[PDB]
Write an enzyme that holds these catalytic residues in place. Structure first.
Site, PDB file in Angstrom:
ATOM      1  N   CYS A 115       0.843  -1.199   0.000  1.00  0.00           N
ATOM      2  CA  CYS A 115       0.000   0.000   0.000  1.00  0.00           C
ATOM      3  C   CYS A 115       0.873   1.242   0.000  1.00  0.00           C
ATOM      4  CB  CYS A 115      -0.947   0.027   1.214  1.00  0.00           C
ATOM      5  SG  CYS A 115      -1.960   1.564   1.396  1.00  0.00           S
TER       6      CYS A 115
ATOM      7  N   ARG B  16       0.241   4.589   2.937  1.00  0.00           N
ATOM      8  CA  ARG B  16       0.296   4.344   4.374  1.00  0.00           C
ATOM      9  C   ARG B  16       0.789   5.523   5.195  1.00  0.00           C
ATOM     10  NH1 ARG B  16       3.976  -0.766   4.841  1.00  0.00           N
ATOM     11  NH2 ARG B  16       4.483  -0.422   2.638  1.00  0.00           N
TER      12      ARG B  16
ATOM     13  N   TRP C 197      -9.029   6.988  -0.413  1.00  0.00           N
ATOM     14  CA  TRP C 197      -9.323   7.730  -1.628  1.00  0.00           C
ATOM     15  C   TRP C 197      -8.377   7.259  -2.734  1.00  0.00           C
ATOM     16  CZ3 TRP C 197      -7.758  10.245   2.924  1.00  0.00           C
ATOM     17  CH2 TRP C 197      -6.411  10.619   2.970  1.00  0.00           C
TER      18      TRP C 197
ATOM     19  N   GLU D 204      -4.944   4.359 -10.497  1.00  0.00           N
ATOM     20  CA  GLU D 204      -5.832   3.215 -10.293  1.00  0.00           C
ATOM     21  C   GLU D 204      -7.015   3.242 -11.247  1.00  0.00           C
ATOM     22  OE1 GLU D 204      -6.244   1.875  -6.039  1.00  0.00           O
ATOM     23  OE2 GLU D 204      -5.896   4.026  -5.711  1.00  0.00           O
TER      24      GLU D 204
HETATM   25  C1  HEM Z   1      -6.217   6.789   1.836  1.00  0.00           C
HETATM   26  C2  HEM Z   1      -5.621   6.663   0.642  1.00  0.00           C
HETATM   27  C3  HEM Z   1      -5.062   5.329   0.090  1.00  0.00           C
HETATM   28  C4  HEM Z   1      -4.447   5.216  -1.096  1.00  0.00           C
HETATM   29  C5  HEM Z   1      -4.172   6.373  -2.093  1.00  0.00           C
HETATM   30  C6  HEM Z   1      -4.067   3.827  -1.276  1.00  0.00           C
HETATM   31  C7  HEM Z   1      -3.413   3.335  -2.385  1.00  0.00           C
HETATM   32  C8  HEM Z   1      -3.209   2.011  -2.662  1.00  0.00           C
HETATM   33  C9  HEM Z   1      -2.825   1.430  -3.930  1.00  0.00           C
HETATM   34  C10 HEM Z   1      -2.602   2.239  -5.219  1.00  0.00           C
HETATM   35  C11 HEM Z   1      -2.698   0.102  -3.759  1.00  0.00           C
HETATM   36  C12 HEM Z   1      -2.306  -0.955  -4.822  1.00  0.00           C
HETATM   37  C13 HEM Z   1      -3.528  -1.764  -5.246  1.00  0.00           C
HETATM   38  C14 HEM Z   1      -3.712  -1.744  -6.739  1.00  0.00           C
HETATM   39  O1  HEM Z   1      -3.204  -0.803  -7.405  1.00  0.00           O
HETATM   40  O2  HEM Z   1      -4.374  -2.673  -7.268  1.00  0.00           O
HETATM   41  C15 HEM Z   1      -3.015  -0.193  -2.371  1.00  0.00           C
HETATM   42  C16 HEM Z   1      -2.996  -1.433  -1.764  1.00  0.00           C
HETATM   43  C17 HEM Z   1      -3.489  -1.723  -0.515  1.00  0.00           C
HETATM   44  N1  HEM Z   1      -4.071  -0.820   0.358  1.00  0.00           N
HETATM   45 FE1  HEM Z   1      -3.933   1.174   0.272  1.00  0.00          FE
HETATM   46  N2  HEM Z   1      -4.479   3.103  -0.156  1.00  0.00           N
HETATM   47  C18 HEM Z   1      -5.106   3.998   0.711  1.00  0.00           C
HETATM   48  C19 HEM Z   1      -5.682   3.680   1.932  1.00  0.00           C
HETATM   49  C20 HEM Z   1      -5.797   2.430   2.499  1.00  0.00           C
HETATM   50  C21 HEM Z   1      -6.562   2.037   3.686  1.00  0.00           C
HETATM   51  C22 HEM Z   1      -7.425   2.981   4.570  1.00  0.00           C
HETATM   52  C23 HEM Z   1      -6.378   0.707   3.824  1.00  0.00           C
HETATM   53  C24 HEM Z   1      -6.876  -0.264   4.910  1.00  0.00           C
HETATM   54  C25 HEM Z   1      -7.203   0.192   6.131  1.00  0.00           C
HETATM   55  C26 HEM Z   1      -5.505   0.244   2.762  1.00  0.00           C
HETATM   56  C27 HEM Z   1      -5.082  -1.044   2.596  1.00  0.00           C
HETATM   57  C28 HEM Z   1      -4.445  -1.543   1.494  1.00  0.00           C
HETATM   58  C29 HEM Z   1      -4.077  -2.928   1.318  1.00  0.00           C
HETATM   59  C30 HEM Z   1      -4.311  -4.066   2.353  1.00  0.00           C
HETATM   60  C31 HEM Z   1      -3.493  -3.033   0.108  1.00  0.00           C
HETATM   61  C32 HEM Z   1      -2.885  -4.307  -0.523  1.00  0.00           C
HETATM   62  C33 HEM Z   1      -3.868  -5.156  -1.295  1.00  0.00           C
HETATM   63  C34 HEM Z   1      -3.260  -6.494  -1.661  1.00  0.00           C
HETATM   64  O3  HEM Z   1      -2.367  -7.019  -0.910  1.00  0.00           O
HETATM   65  O4  HEM Z   1      -3.699  -7.042  -2.714  1.00  0.00           O
HETATM   66  N3  HEM Z   1      -5.195   1.309   1.984  1.00  0.00           N
HETATM   67  N4  HEM Z   1      -3.299   0.996  -1.746  1.00  0.00           N
HETATM   68  C1  LIG Z   2      -8.089   1.337   0.634  1.00  0.00           C
HETATM   69  C2  LIG Z   2      -7.609   1.448  -0.790  1.00  0.00           C
HETATM   70  C3  LIG Z   2      -7.474   2.693  -1.379  1.00  0.00           C
HETATM   71  C4  LIG Z   2      -7.019   2.786  -2.702  1.00  0.00           C
HETATM   72  N1  LIG Z   2      -6.887   3.999  -3.279  1.00  0.00           N
HETATM   73  N2  LIG Z   2      -6.736   1.673  -3.412  1.00  0.00           N
HETATM   74  C5  LIG Z   2      -6.850   0.443  -2.867  1.00  0.00           C
HETATM   75  C6  LIG Z   2      -6.545  -0.689  -3.626  1.00  0.00           C
HETATM   76  C7  LIG Z   2      -6.635  -1.946  -3.038  1.00  0.00           C
HETATM   77  C8  LIG Z   2      -6.457  -3.201  -3.794  1.00  0.00           C
HETATM   78  C9  LIG Z   2      -6.210  -4.419  -3.196  1.00  0.00           C
HETATM   79  C10 LIG Z   2      -6.150  -5.587  -3.952  1.00  0.00           C
HETATM   80  C11 LIG Z   2      -6.421  -5.557  -5.315  1.00  0.00           C
HETATM   81  O1  LIG Z   2      -6.393  -6.732  -6.028  1.00  0.00           O
HETATM   82  C12 LIG Z   2      -5.307  -7.225  -6.801  1.00  0.00           C
HETATM   83  C13 LIG Z   2      -5.717  -8.569  -7.366  1.00  0.00           C
HETATM   84  C14 LIG Z   2      -6.223  -8.709  -8.662  1.00  0.00           C
HETATM   85  S1  LIG Z   2      -6.547 -10.394  -8.859  1.00  0.00           S
HETATM   86  C15 LIG Z   2      -6.030 -10.887  -7.284  1.00  0.00           C
HETATM   87  N3  LIG Z   2      -5.627  -9.747  -6.658  1.00  0.00           N
HETATM   88  C16 LIG Z   2      -6.756  -4.349  -5.916  1.00  0.00           C
HETATM   89  C17 LIG Z   2      -7.083  -4.283  -7.393  1.00  0.00           C
HETATM   90  N4  LIG Z   2      -8.492  -3.868  -7.545  1.00  0.00           N
HETATM   91  C18 LIG Z   2      -6.805  -3.188  -5.144  1.00  0.00           C
HETATM   92  C19 LIG Z   2      -7.091  -2.062  -1.731  1.00  0.00           C
HETATM   93  C20 LIG Z   2      -7.411  -0.944  -0.977  1.00  0.00           C
HETATM   94  C21 LIG Z   2      -7.289   0.315  -1.542  1.00  0.00           C
END
Ligand code: HEM
Ligand SMILES: Cc1cc(N)nc2cc(-c3ccc(OCc4cscn4)c(CN)c3)ccc12
Ligand code: HEM
Ligand SMILES: Cc1cc(N)nc2cc(-c3ccc(OCc4cscn4)c(CN)c3)ccc12
Ligand SMILES: C[C@H](O)[C@H](O)[C@H]1CNc2nc(N)[nH]c(=O)c2N1
Ligand SMILES: C[C@H](O)[C@H](O)[C@H]1CNc2nc(N)[nH]c(=O)c2N1
Ligand SMILES: [Zn+2]
Lengths: 411, 411
Positions: B108, B111, B280, B285
């Site tokens: 993430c 963070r 947000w 994304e």
């Molecule tokens: C507040 C602004 C936040 C932004 C801009 C953000 C941004 C991102 C982005 C770009 C990813 C990559 C996922 C993807 O692109 O598919 C991600 C992953 C993740 N975010 Fe954040 N996030 C935010 C807040 C949070 C919050 C509040 C939580 C949980 C309390 C969180 C938990 C996670 C987790 C667990 C992942 C990993 C997902 C995985 O392992 O597949 N995020 N975040």
């Molecule tokens: C809180 C928050 C804010 C934010 N701006 N972005 C976030 C993106 C993710 C997140 C987590 C796993 C994901 O899946 C990957 C995948 C594809 S197939 C098996 N795994 C994706 C993709 N949709 C997004 C989670 C939380 C977010």
């Protein structure tokens, strides 16, 4: 542990058994992944060498469909005796070519490996002097450049003996632009080369102190002090960089060289160490336009390009850096293509690599790949390698990093 | 044992001691790195150690380690486990756990915000209607008329694994996808499978390109139930471009609140199978992955046509050029409507600052380079040049299987 890799864009699933042949270590553990560390890492001994030689000869004779043959066992005997006597051994020409081609085949960070079996191997193991090295290197450059129709090549200098007689090319690449720090602020030319550009001057070079001065070669034979040599300019093919839409782009005064020839790595075959083995191919466009031109610790030209485009550089959210970056990389491709110098764009090369992966899983059982390095430095997710799971493991023969000579040389 | 990471653009080196607290496993071995693999029922036996280490952490963070409050809580959890087989977290403990699960989320980039998480305790919920009500209040609170706030809602923990709470949606707000009989897909291809389940459960589909999906909610292991989020609660943004007036005519929009609802929150050995969380969007994304992935809305070509780019050869970088414009339009639209969004330049810079601060005050910051680096313009963001150590810390968010693959249907 007959591992599987999935492409999340196409759902193609490949099964990897080749990784079980892996020997060296990755630097990761079950508790920590170091996949994004740049470098996670005296001669061998009579007992270290023979297992290594046997491993290599076993796969060589397998590849030529003669595993367990008279010729196979005889060669093992012969090498085993040469090690026992001479404490090293020498590769047959056929083994040398195979080892080099497979060191490329195994380079998990190289996206251009679909070409791996077409390498031109130049055996320079009869070389004894830096003047001799220079001659072999000019012949390399001329063959590889081929008037802009570039060809892959490696030139292999004599193998390490005791570490005191090392052959080394001190340049990181055969062709690179000089870097001079200014009395006032930042840097003129190429900042990545500032130290080497000084070790050249501090060793005798007279620098024209321009923006794009081809550095001299600094060649070390049998462990003596290295010697400066100027590559004949007519052997250094360069591309002036213009834009197909923006006439002011020409005025930026940018050029780059056509030949990427890495010269600071170490080639390992059957336990033998080739510390001087410059190899060369052709550029992927992003290597120049994204990294060389736009990295902040390099030419860093994004500032003024965007200004000339009159983009709103006040807020990052206008994506002016992204917009300029695209245009620069369009120009690089346009210029090489216009001057008929070989180049590949990052879409074509990553698509080629997916086809190559496919081939290696089918005819070899796998293909070690370093996602962190295969995915291009721009437009990552619209290339197919982004959605491709990859398994990274170390196979041999291999190219390896080695200390920079000036920190080691008994000067 | 200390470990060093290097930023190769700034030469800043940081020392990680935190990885020593790691217990879980990465999937990597010394002989294979699985760094780019997407994804690599609990008894009293293993639960008190998990509880004890969490409570040790919790009381260390509040400077009460070894206090009587700390020893008494350990005893109380101990007896509650042996007599009841599980245990309940105090409110203070749940809030800490959820915040640290986010802090520990190595993939993430957001963070820096981890300590400002609004934690909604829905552990008294018993029915799907109650779940709908809690989710509605989450969506209203988090959306805040466009001034988004991070939030998580935590439903009752798993007990015997036969009474799970689950949100069957992968995100609380997401557009439907419909496979047409001619092979084309209407709407979001990522959601075709879930859309079909909703339709089968009795959802009347508008069959449009941007239909908000219903909530499909499962309480206490019962069959899931359909609910429609009140549309006045679903904040959406129409996508226009600041220079291209034809861009609005593509008919694109997106929702403002990214709220992930299919993950599992692990705290002190307790498993919270329903724990939707939201923040947000980072611009890419939506603009890179949602619109431009070939397996998603896949709008590159239609944007490329309307821009009139050379779409014959890919070395014109028409794909890269259209991608930048789409992402400009996403950011412009959200800012114009005062909906919180962050560009990938701002967010990666923030992450680097966060990461450095976490090394100073925590001794480490687990980070997954493969996921942190943005899917466009990678090397012009500072995280690209940042070495990163990936390891697994608890509390954590984990993947869990899609509930329709495991659910025993009551009928
Ligand atoms: C507040 C602004 C936040 C932004 C801009 C953000 C941004 C991102 C982005 C770009 C990813 C990559 C996922 C993807 O692109 O598919 C991600 C992953 C993740 N975010 Fe954040 N996030 C935010 C807040 C949070 C919050 C509040 C939580 C949980 C309390 C969180 C938990 C996670 C987790 C667990 C992942 C990993 C997902 C995985 O392992 O597949 N995020 N975040
Ligand atoms: C809180 C928050 C804010 C934010 N701006 N972005 C976030 C993106 C993710 C997140 C987590 C796993 C994901 O899946 C990957 C995948 C594809 S197939 C098996 N795994 C994706 C993709 N949709 C997004 C989670 C939380 C977010
Ligand atoms: C022919 C066209 C080729 C292309 C387009 C190509 C492309 C690339 C690219 C983009 C990288 C990423 C490293 C960076 O960004 O600086 C790379 C690394 C590498 N290439 Fe290739 N390459 C080619 C040929 C070759 C040949 C002929 C060899 C050796 C015989 C070779 C060996 C390597 C090695 C060893 C590395 C990575 C070294 C490391 O850091 O571990 N390549 N290549
Ligand atoms: C044959 C060929 C063709 C081609 N088009 N590109 C190539 C790129 C590389 C290559 C391999 C490692 C590198 O190291 C990064 C680094 C910085 S600090 C410690 N390591 C670099 C860049 N310096 C380039 C090698 C061969 C290539
Ligand atoms: C195969 C590969 O691991 C997969 O495509 C990953 C790569 N990195 C990613 N990074 C982010 N931020 N989001 C993703 O969905 C992915 N997908
Ligand atoms: C820190 C990070 O490991 C480092 O910047 C790597 C990332 N990926 C790369 N990928 C390529 N192709 N070339 C590089 O130099 C790097 N640098
Ligand atoms: Zn790893």
């Amino acid at each position: 542990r007959f591992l599987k890799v999935k492409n999340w864009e196409t759902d193609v699933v490949l099964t990897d058994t080749l990784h079980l042949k892996s020997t060296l270590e990755t630097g990761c553990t079950e508790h920590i992944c170091m996949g994004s560390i740049m470098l996670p890492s005296d001669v061998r001994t009579k007992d270290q060498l023979f297992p290594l030689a046997k491993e290599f000869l076993d796969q060589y004779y397998s590849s030529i469909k003669r595993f367990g043959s008279k010729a196979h066992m005889d060669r093992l005997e012969e090498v085993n005796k040469e090690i026992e006597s001479t404490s090293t051994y020498q590769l047959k020409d056929t083994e040398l070519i195979y080892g080099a081609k497979h060191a490329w085949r195994n380079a998990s960070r190289c996206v251009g490996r679909i070409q791996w079996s077409k390498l031109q191997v130049f055996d320079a193991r009869d070389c004894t002097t830096a003047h001799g090295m220079f001659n072999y290197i000019c012949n390399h450059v001329k063959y590889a450049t081929n008037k802009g129709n570039l060809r892959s090549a490696i030139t292999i200098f004599p193998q390490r003996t005791d570490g005191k007689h090392d052959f080394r090319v001190w340049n990181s690449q055969l062709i690179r632009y000089a870097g001079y720090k200014q009395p006032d602020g930042s840097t003129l030319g190429d900042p990545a080369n500032v130290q080497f550009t000084e070790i050249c001057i501090q060793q005798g070079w007279k620098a024209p102190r321009g923006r794009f001065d081809v550095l001299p070669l600094l060649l070390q034979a049998n462990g003596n002090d290295p010697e400066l040599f100027q590559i004949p300019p007519e052997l250094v093919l360069e591309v002036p960089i213009r834009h197909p839409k923006f006439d002011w782009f020409k005025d930026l005064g940018l050029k780059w060289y056509g030949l990427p020839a890495v010269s600071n790595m170490l080639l390992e075959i059957g336990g033998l160490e080739f510390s001087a083995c410059p190899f060369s191919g052709w550029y992927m466009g992003t290597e120049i336009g994204v990294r060389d031109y736009c990295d902040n610790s390099r030419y860093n030209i994004l500032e003024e390009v965007a200004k000339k485009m009159d983009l709103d550089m006040r807020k990052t959210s206008s994506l002016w850096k992204d917009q300029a970056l695209v245009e620069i990389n369009i120009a690089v491709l346009y210029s090489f293509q216009s001057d008929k110098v070989t180049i590949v764009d990052h879409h074509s090369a990553t698509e080629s690599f997916i086809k190559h992966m496919e081939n290696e899983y089918r005819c070899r059982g796998g293909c070690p790949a370093d996602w962190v390095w295969i995915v291009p430095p721009m437009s990552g997710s619209i290339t197919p390698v982004f959605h491709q799971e990859m398994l990274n493991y170390r196979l041999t023969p291999s190219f390896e990093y080695q200390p920079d000579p000036w920190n080691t040389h008994v000067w």
